[model samples]
Target: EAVTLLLVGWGYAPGMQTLEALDAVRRADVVYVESYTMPGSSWLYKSVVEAAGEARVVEASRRDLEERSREIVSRALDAVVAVVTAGDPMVATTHSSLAAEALEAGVAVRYIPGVSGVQAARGATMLSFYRFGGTVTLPGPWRGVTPISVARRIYLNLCAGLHTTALLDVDERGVQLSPGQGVSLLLEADREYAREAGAPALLARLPSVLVEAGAGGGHRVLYWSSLERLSTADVEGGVYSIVIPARLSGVEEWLLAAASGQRRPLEYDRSVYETVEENCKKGVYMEPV
Candidate 1:
């Protein structure tokens, strides 16, 4: 009996698919590609089809993977079958469940891992991989919004001094969430949480980091900014990610500052706070409320 393999990490453009993943597609008796998450997934489909060459290829939806998995196992019973997704092979939890179902009947399975989109965003900033807190997916309007849940999670992540990786969620219509829209959603969530807790609205600003496609431009590509600076920030295209780092370590401060076209992060944090002679001139003394 042949085996089943899950392949992923094929990105938005041509030439982003890996040779190892392509090799798997070449050997498979059948291949399936599903990327309802991306708007231009057909572009990914075109490259994969060419790579599959002699092997048969088809497109599937996430529902098919979960509900129609028996079809996949039936084929894997006698021939190599492949299913492809964007980014990491198992980023979506359903893939594991599908694989489990297939395995109960004794079908063999293999997972081909690839660098996920969150990793790409993390790498673009030169931030330490170990420093990030946790991952969150902000889904589209169709699923309905739960702002308090999203806000508290991020606020807590920031308090812990860990960076947050906010991956934009896609809907059935395949419309990609632009970074600006994402930013608005986040702030809305924060306000909702504050209202629920009977606390003052969050007054701090997050240094929103936007990752453009590398080929978009040189230093001009990334739209980097702080809470105050975001008011005027502009870009010509999609906002890849909205990363909010926790209190930066001294070194992370320097690296990200350079990216944002600002001075070092932690460097400035300490610099501004360094003096015992406070910048008392900048503010009025607070009296008892």
Candidate 2:
């Protein structure tokens, strides 16, 4: 008899001033928000809470939602309810199942659109989206979990000449994986295929792309170099992701060559990388501008 809305807002609250989200908080009898599961959402808690003004907010953890989801759905069954997450909601198994259960219970449910990281990375890339193959992650958002099968996926994608974007995982406190660590995982993945198939690692010293926001929230920085070179790269602080590309098209190669600049090869400031990691140790997280 009541409506259930899933409010998907970015961690930084950009483009979250939607009529539906505001109205749901105002008109709904109950509101629930999940932010603990999101590693990069440290700053989002206050911003999201303010949006739910005048409504008592039920904050749930992954365990809470996994074990006691029915209670959350039951609340939606009887009253106008909303669920909030920092990023594009329902991308995970937990969020999808919760929505599915709520729908099965005959509650009216709908989604409020939000920006996705995949699209953001797309804009920063020069590679053709049409060439993108299986995108994988080194680790995942959840702490204490490591997914190894992703490496084979990347290796296969490259052999097929399709680009692969390997999303590096962050620790629970939003601490990110450095380029060195991420490439190590990738190298290990490459080994798995080499042992059996008896082919040289498909991606040894291959050209790669690393993109992330620049320091002080300045323009984005796209690193242009081979994977072997970037493994030791030191960048200034920001949450970062990697793009393990297939063979570069002429256009992509040209674009990267320009950024290579007058230097023998491209690299970033090692001093700044040290400073950024130091700040992160002090619990300083970068916010998107």
**Per-residue lDDT over 108-153 for candidate 1, one digit per residue giving the tens place of the 0 to 100 score:** 7787765555566677777777888877776655667755567666
Error of 2 at 86 (Å): 2.3
Tell me the spans in candidate 1 whose CA falls farther than 4 Å from its real position: 75-77, 213-224, 227-234, 261-289
lDDT of prediction 2: 0.59
Predictions in order: lDDT:
0.61, 0.59
Q: In terms of TM-score, how similar is model 2 to the real structure?
A: 0.75
Q: Cα lDDT of model 1 overall? A: 0.61
The most accurate candidate by TM-score is 1
Q: Which 10 consecutive positions of candidate 2 have the poorest summed lDDT?
A: 280-289
Worst 10 residues of 1 by lDDT: 279-288
